[PDB]
């Protein structure tokens, strides 16, 4: 079967999807290297242990109300413009981690090698691995991509090694599954896609996790036609994820970064990373969102007018603070300590 050299050769790297070095922007760290076979089963579910521990990402709003887990899978669902590829670089900048591994699937040449630029500017660069496949390459060179990627990734959890792990997209990863087997011989089953993609999206999908030693962490991004419009492919993968950070068209439009909706967005492993006095004050912080979201389209579609009630003051005072909040600009690390303070400040505004 099809097996690419990874180790810590590929460290600071960049890898074509039969995993040839075409570029580094940084130098090599150690001449260490093995053959794997890129697509290959996710490990027994009896040698994982459980997501238990919470990654910290920096992201006063993930961290917050959507904390992540040591392990798990998570979805970035977006339409275009939305900041994606801004938010995956924060990621890079302010999570800790061992290793990084970045798999762009289809991705135009003009963007992977902004991808790389930021790479070589970064200081975690000799942590970073990118594999791409650009929209000229093959469908069977785009799978092989994200599956070059995913096994970077188990390389170096093998070695005992936190990793983070980036698929963008998991979109373009099914097309080109759907293509491949549609041009081996396979009929379409829902919206044009066989049935083989459905069972080789789990495939893909499955081998990141914890163990007692190394420990994948993954980000799948997901490309929406629209912020809201109906999308069965999106759907199922978003099924099959641990959770799911839907950034909104909306709010990038106004300025508002990381362009997350929080009240569409979960974390599926928060109950079994958080204390319990954190996911009391998240609990009170999401309904007091719902309330502000209430209030909103109750008086702004209602002609709002700034005085007639001072409640819907008060309102909407604390509907721009917590706004405020949420936005984060790079190069802004928030320390889980405080967000954690801000997240108890705005459980207690709950309380009004
Ligand atoms: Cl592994
Ligand atoms: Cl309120």
Known sequence: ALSAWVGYSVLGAVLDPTGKIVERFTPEVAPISEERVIDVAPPSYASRVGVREPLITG???????????????????????????????????????????????????????????????????????????????????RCNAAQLATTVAEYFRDQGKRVVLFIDSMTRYARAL????????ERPARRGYPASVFDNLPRLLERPGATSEGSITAFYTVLLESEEEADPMADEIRSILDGHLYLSRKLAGQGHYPAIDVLKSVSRVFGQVTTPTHAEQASAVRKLMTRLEELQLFIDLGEYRPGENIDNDRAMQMRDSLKAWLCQPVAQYSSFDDTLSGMNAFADQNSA
Request: charged share 25%.
């Open 178 to 185: 759907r293509d491949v087997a549609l041009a081996s011989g």
């Open 59 to 141: 992201v006063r709003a993930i961290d917050g109300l959507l904390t992540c887990g040591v392990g798990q899978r998570m979805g970035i669902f977006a339409s275009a413009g939305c900041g994606k590829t801004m938010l995956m670089h924060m990621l890079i900048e302010q999570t800790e981690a061992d290793v990084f591994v970045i798999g762009l699937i289809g991705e135009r040449g003009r963007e992977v090698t902004e991808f790389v630029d930021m790479l070589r500017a970064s200081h975690k660069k000799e942590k970073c691995v990118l594999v791409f496949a650009t929209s000229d390459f093959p469908s069977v060179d």
